[PDB]
């Protein structure tokens, strides 16, 4: 058979060293003298031949200071151990490690070996130098049935290890149940404390173990704390261990309520309790409602106490909100059936809303009363006015946030609560006193209320009379201190996402590289690199933007063209000729947010119209001057003379090239047959402006916004106008006043030093920086200069100069501008008081309408 080699050569090695020889005088050879023979099952014959000998095993061999008796416990034979025990070989003799032969047979499971040592009265209590013993060694090793056969021979089981831990305390820490099954049968103590008071119970919950804690309760363990007071319960929380907590509750239902009281404990990890409750909510519906209803009684308590003027603000204020993010989170998970998964809570299925929101309503009735005060206050105090607005308005704004957080749970994604709406209009006169009191509360408490887009759409009540010098700080303050739509605050960190740039053609190459790379991966110092060239750590970056700036307007690509003013750029309507047409546009919009979000500027300026579309704003008829003034004039004739005197009627459906034939298409959808009624030409002026650009462009423009919106929240930059926006991109320009004085050209009636003009510039010197800059746009659109300055005016109608002309009339009329000529136009203001009254007043309303 296969193991016959072992059968034969067990007899052979007897012959090969048959003649007897005494063991070595040295410690190195004795292990060499017998170790193969013991393994080779000579254990009986060696016990026969070494019955006559003169050496002892305890003269330990080699560096390790072990014995063959340790090997005797290893290799698993007794008949040699018969003779070894006749010699009196001390089992409790130890290595340098302090270990025994027993631990080997324990480690190896040689049962009969473990027996005979105790027949020699082995001191089991001798721990090694590490402080661990056999019984400890086995429970961890999960070897129980021997431990039944072992522990029976001793009564000192309670005797601890070096540190005080019993094997029972160990097994619970490891979850070795059947081990524990035997130890208790063998007379183990249950509530035996460690030095710290740690029962085996405390150890199990630390480990997150279920089934053993079930058992200790059956056999009648006790729920106790440690020395410092920490319970088993606080562990499973800190562990996130849900199912173990469920077991305790079957035997101590008082604990459920204790959980709920933990949520107002600041020290805990909110992202652990979600594991617990979200688990128990799924456990059963009869538990489910008890949870939500139980949460609210804490909320209703804290709120009335929050409104109490004695309570400290910041403490309770999180303690409330620390609850509701779950309470919202649970309802969107919805009612889960008894011992079964989720149910929706649809109509007819018990109306969860009928009960759970009920305890709260006192909070909202309580709420409205204070606001009713303030209305009577503000209305009746307006002539004779610490003020409660100054004192406690910070508090209420905590609660109003609670009223959007709750109501938006019982509506679908992205859909507004109607009940919230009516609440706003009732008190709209009051809320405006808070925003003017503190504008940037809008970022913290009223965040979603006024920056969720469809609400921002609806809640323009406030966004206008939102003060505007607020914006003046906020070109930069809410860029540098962030723009908190949850993400313009901190960045991720990314290193190994390097871009290989193709210097020879960056545009087409980088089109690919970006569309691969992911979004948040690029909100950091971008790893700009070329093919096989380091160049610079990051200073190379600026080449990438600055160069792409001129390559988008690379006219051979046919993306953009100049205005009639020759200075500003706009998208080419006939760009449809391209084979690949739209995909390039998407590349652009991805750029600008990165120039923005990393707050480095760009040198290009576009036409004023193109900004109005980005902000979703409508166009006016002046915006046609970029493409062709003649239509703008032709549209002006319509306003110059009403249709009452008109003989040539217009059609509301006109031949137009849209990258096709001169197709006559309706100006209004379907109503292409009507004509210019006296009450209808306003729309005719309107749609010719819109649908000349829109219909030709709208497939193009949108791809730009998909990427520009990718890295930017649209809800924020509705903040800015169209005249504040171009400055974040190309920087606040420089203005030499003298250079602007010298290049003037006075004409059409005015002389260069009449009283009015001397008094004009007197007003300008009083003006700020962000208003003179808007004057320039009002007459040139363009907002910034070339190198040579105003002496090197780009002009556009040629490189012509900042010019002025007259339109004489009494001060009733206001200024006007002609852009392409880069000329200003002024009705006369015949006095310095007229100037000091009308001009100072006329410029502002003239320089911008609200």
Numbering used by the authors: 1 to 385, 442 to 906
Task: Give excerpts from the publication.
HACE1 (HECT domain and Ankyrin repeat (AKR) containing E3 Ubiquitin Protein Ligase 1) is an AKR‐containing HECT E3 ligase in the “Other” subfamily. HACE1 is composed of an AKR domain at its N‐terminus (aa 26–252), a MID domain (aa 253–522) in the middle of the protein, and a HECT domain at its C‐terminus (aa 523–909). HACE1 is a tumor suppressor E3 ligase that has been reported to inhibit breast cancer cell proliferation through 26S proteasome‐mediated degradation of RAC1. Here, we report the cryo‐EM structures of monomeric and dimeric HACE1 along with in vitro biochemical assays.
Through 2D classification, we identified a G‐shaped HACE1 monomer and a circular dimer in which the subunits faced each other in an anti‐parallel orientation. Global resolution was 3.9 Å for the monomer and 4.6 Å for the dimer by gold standard FSC using a 0.143 cutoff. Coulomb potential map of the monomer was slightly larger than the predicted model, indicating an additional density attached to the N‐terminus (red dotted circle). Using MS analysis, we confirmed that this density was caused by the uncleaved GST tag. We observed that a 56‐residue loop (MID‐loop, aa 386–441) in the MID domain is disordered and could not be modeled. The HACE1 HECT domain forms an inverted Y‐shape conformation wherein the C‐lobe is situated close to the N‐lobe small subdomain, the putative binding site for the E2‐conjugating enzyme. The electrostatic surface potential map of the HACE1 monomer shows that the N‐terminal region is highly basic whereas the C‐terminal region is acidic. Superimposition of the HECT domains of HACE1 monomer and dimer reveals the movement of the HECT domain C‐lobe by 17.2° which in turn causes the catalytic cysteine (C876) to slant by 14.7°. This movement is likely coordinated with the ≈5 Å increase in the gap of the HECT domain small N‐lobe induced by the insertion of the N‐terminal helix (aa 1–21) from the other subunit. Remarkably, monomeric HACE1 displays enhanced ubiquitination activity compared with dimeric HACE1.
